[PDB]
Design a protein around this ligand. Sequence first.
Ligand code: HEC
Length: 88
Amino acid sequence: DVAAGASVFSANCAACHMGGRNVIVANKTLSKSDLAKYLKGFDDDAVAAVAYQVTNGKNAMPGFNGRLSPLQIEDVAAYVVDQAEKGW
Ligand code: HEC
């Protein structure tokens, strides 16, 4: 689950979120704080909130709804939440 999410992450996310940052929008990192400050519902269900932004995305953040499977999405989400909580 988290090991799978790691692979989905480096194959589809590392390009912009290397080390849990945000090369495009500097202040929109994948840190615990940022995910809390900007991700709706994050403080309700962390993985679900991340899985949401991943499926739909916004602005410069592309959606993966057609490219990734629901399973691959829940996996990268758990991985991200895991990394945020651990500090990357
Ligand atoms: C570069 C083109 C990106 C790729 C490919 C992915 N993401 Fe992204 N992400 C990007 C931007 C420009 C932004 C911010 C957009 C905005 O204005 O809101 C984001 C944001 C996120 C977030 C929330 C970050 C925060 O506000 O703290 C999440 C949860 C996120 N991105 C996850 C993520 C994952 C798992 C990806 C791989 C499938 C991924 N992103 C790819 C730009 C880019």
